[PDB]
Amino acid sequence: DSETDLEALFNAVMNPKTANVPQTVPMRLRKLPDSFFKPP
Amino acid sequence: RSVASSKLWMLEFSAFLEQQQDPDTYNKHLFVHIGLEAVDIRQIYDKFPEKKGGLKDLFERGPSNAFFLVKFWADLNTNGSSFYGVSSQYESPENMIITCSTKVCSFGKQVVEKVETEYARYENGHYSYRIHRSPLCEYMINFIHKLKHLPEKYMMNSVLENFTILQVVTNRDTQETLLCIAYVFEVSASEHGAQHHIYRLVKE
């Protein structure tokens, strides 16, 4: 089971071998407008 | 009037770090500032609180024209004498007592809620509401510090995938949703600094 706390959040990115947070669909792969990822 | 329902318009929103150099000298850095395409709300429900009072419940209850999604590109390029704050300004044709609830969310779970009550000031036939220099909570200050200490920009964006803010502004007496604003974040790379896109949240 995963943890959802602050250290775990940054740990998951810094030390991915010990990551234990929920898995999700990247925003870029969702049904969102093109402008969402292109800033003005 | 972008972030505006039938009853309330948010004219200004800014989160900032103010540093007191000396008694007469202050340096202010803006992290994000506001001063419309549609997004299917179902695409973002997972990033926000569920159950009664959560985003889906609020959206279903309406009005539909009160719901917005703001994508911020945040400017993190900044350095005892620090104040982290948020200021916002609103206008309404009505004199209401409003409550502004700000929820910081991580992997769709509420981590903290700030609740502020604001009363109206008459202004040229309409009414103004201002949340002036609301202190940024310790969690947010710590989050910014941790983000900045990450070695890579792609890492910051990775963390930000699962960090959101939900702002719900309510008529206190009636509990009508006046504005509900979902905030999503990336780091700014632009030379101009912080940027944003504002979207209308729709049912499909």
Ligand SMILES: CCCCCCCCCCCCCC(=O)O
């Ligand atoms: C990527 C995070 C840095 C961008 C600055 C965060 C934006 C602040 C939004 C207002 C949230 C206020 C919540 C609180 O501390 O009470």
